[PDB]
């Protein structure tokens, strides 16, 4: 019996069966409801739409995300999304497979407890487990030492591991991820006269950001060069045929990853977060940590991110250390692949939280078994 | 059948087979335990690490020494270290070889008794013996007259021998050795803003002390010269790439050997200890004792120690006596070489404490056979 | 002419005139700078804010501490803080009064040298002196024998004194104080879903810690009792009207004083630090040291700290010794009161470092005069 691996990100759901090379169901984690609840007679009317179907007819829907910053904010919508995942995407019976779930570090306890309670009492799974996403990413890379910088839609976090041992006091969390970048792109697109306010327009802006943005090697020099020419400008076509043009916004939008003050946030960038995490470890671990900086998540898919991170870390670290940044081509799915690997191990089969232990101990069992 | 020679120092273990020119296993006498007992699934988790392996991954371990000042303080860890020595380093069966052990003079009796009991009942050796380290050092030098000043990691002691005869009433013991010097270097490195507190940082400080320290010929003049220039300063590179610089600390750290008041200790230096040991012998032995002062141990490996000791002894002794200090290049292994020589002698083969005598008399047999 | 007494702690500044019963100026040791450097036309714009004024409008400022762990890390900000202290708080001319300063033991020498240079060349004082804080605390108590455990915001240290004589080799330093506790409270408040990241939020968290925390007599029993009831929970109101609730965090946050492994630190607690300091003295001093354990600083103001310290020391000490822990009600100002007493003594008036000796010898004079 193979386990099911579900990665509940803030933006997307990655689900599949353990042992597969890639997830087989990747759909947006959205729920949409019709603005005008009324349909032509004879047509089937649905109260809400989930996933790709919600994304397809977003023009007449209001879209909601049940997860913000890695924390579930609407449990009914989360339950609907999980039901969709199990019954329409994977097309399996969850009562026959154990389920491996994922969560971000330094989350509130009630989130984990509700996850366990809903898995055991609503879907009637035989067993389950909750794992940290960066640890799974390190599993995917086939390494036992390194620091993982994970950035998706909700949060950014860094977890260092040395020779298989965890360093919990060095875990750092930054509340700046892809959704913040999409909002900032929306805000700065008003300078050119383009106005996006609705949910579907938010999705269009996210599309534009994914297709047109990149990270500059030197920000001031690139701004100066953009002010002196026009070859940086690119065009994008809207669903209705209109065309928008973007200049320095292309590298200005992702610059908020390294300069969080662009969003009005008093916080350090991802480079400084990684450096601070490394400096909170023992002196004898830092060389290897510098040698194995690993990127993971969708927000690390910008062009030129590795070069910029290497430059910043070289500036911050001593001149003798060698900084190496690894950017796998499939790093958008590293968490799922690592979860599949972990759930496929013979030694892991004793770590499941079974239904008997749950019936004995309540939802609090997850705290003393997953850590 | 050759015997095994094991020198259980406070800092290091020297082990080998009798008849060899040098010991074949020299590793630190440490046991390390993981701070966070948890490893990635699929990895082999060990409760504790011994020796070079413990030294290699000290960044995630807490290191302990089972011996302080020549006295075993943790018998389980000592047993683990001996098991490592026999089975992973030497790769022999201790039940087939007699074992020669070493101890410092004026130690408590229970230490020797426990050594004998553990050797006979846990490792099932055929025979064993316990010898004094300075006597073995005198064996190594091919001489029958002289006074040996031995200084390693735990204790310093002086043993005079004349024409092969022992002088037990003249043996002196000083509780100041390399570990005290490492602690004092740690304390005085805080003046420059460098902070070392953990066990791995203790090992790094010991490394620095070994590589950068020396003994000044005249302390006050050298301090004055250091206050007037900067050519004494040297640099050291930490495992993480940072660089520290040391000035007069280089000769201030080992000066506590000759001025124990630097450590807050009411005791005489090694020169005064040696002189007092010589003055406790008969008037007819002192000339030869002055003529054959022999150094042994790792703490006697500082640069310029022989010149300083000669100057101090010349100051203390009458002007007609000739003071000669011998500093063999391999004096860090003189105890092991002397033990090998002693255990390889045809006349020594009747001095072994056999298993029959042990079964007859209990662990108290060691007191009436080794002396 | 009365002297000025300034206690430059890591968290707060206590300043006043010698002979007074209490300090007359107690303000936070912070410097704040506006995030958005722009103000309405006609308003007075200040580059930076110091002290209570910085604390009052922290919502638009970024706050910095110029001292960490008793070591000045930003000398321009320290100079600004001293200028504020002299000219806006005390409202005196520093060129007319001698100044008594304080420092933590085992600090780097450059800190003291810079203090002397800035006092003599920037503020043009006639004389000055630097004293150890625990010694001043012992002055305040009217006793000549005892061991002082001082804990403020930067560091914790223990200094034993017997019959007026100092024991420098027994001074111990622990790098765990109130700021570490505030950071740990911030970290563990994420379990309930409360997120504090900014500097002003750090100040709010420190407020919460001061108002709601206490030390448990037995940690395991108290944790068990907290897991079984809800009467331990208390509520706190934020500046914006929102309400947070805390359960076992109240006694979990200060427990890191006795269990430094909660912070990932390989170090002994304050009880073990005090015991180790006592055990490094002569056998004939320990009875009195056990009899006169004295608390000082703001981190010793938790409820139940004396009982817990007494229990731990009773566990560690022989059963015949009497352990007495003194907790003065005004122990948050013992260093300042002791400094005032010391600077008001007729015999102390020859210990000042005058401007003539400084002009003769440079900033190095402080090393051969204050010790
Ligand atoms: N090629 C790309 N370039 C830039 N950003 C991308 C790219 N692909 C995806 N993203 C961004 O990554 C974010 C979410 O990715 P993902 O790691 O799946 O998030 P989560 O794991 O939280 O669901 C989205 O906001 C999206 O805009
Ligand atoms: N070249 C050197 N210079 C100075 N000190 C040294 C040197 N080599 C070793 N030491 C010191 O010698 C001490 C232990 O040496 P050793 O004689 O092996 O001790 P033990 O016999 O007690 O194990 C260590 O504390 C180490 O710092
Ligand atoms: N009543 C209290 N209970 C607990 N902690 C307190 C209390 N009052 C002050 N503190 C803590 O004491 C710390 C600093 O006190 P103080 O001794 O003035 O430090 P410093 O001398 O380093 O300026 C602060 O971090 C504060 O949180
Ligand atoms: Mg993700
Ligand atoms: Mg030795
Ligand atoms: Mg203080």
Author numbering:
A (entry chain B), B (entry chain C), C (entry chain A): 6 to 376
Which sentences did the original study use to describe this structure?
The cytoskeletal protein actin plays a critical role in the pathogenicity of the intracellular parasite, Toxoplasma gondii, mediating invasion and egress, cargo transport, and organelle inheritance.
Decreasing the incubation time and increasing the ATP concentration allowed us to circumvent this outcome. Thus, to capture long filaments in cryo conditions, we froze TgAct1 samples after a 10 to 20-min incubation period with 1 mM ATP. A single TgAct1 protomer is in nearly the same conformation as skeletal actin, with Cα RMSD values of 0.5 and 0.8 for chicken and rabbit actin, respectively. Two of these substitutions, amino acids Pro42 and Ile44, point in the opposite direction relative to the comparable residues in skeletal actin (Gln41 and Val43). While Val43 of skeletal actin sits within a hydrophobic portion of the binding pocket, the comparable residue in TgAct1 (Ile44) is displaced by 5 Å and does not make inter-protomer contacts. These changes in the D-loop conformation break most of the backbone interactions that occur among skeletal actin d-loop residues 41–44 (TgAct1 42–44), and hydrogen bond contacts between side chains are lost due to a combination of residue substitution and mainchain displacement (TgAct1 amino acids 39–41 and 46).
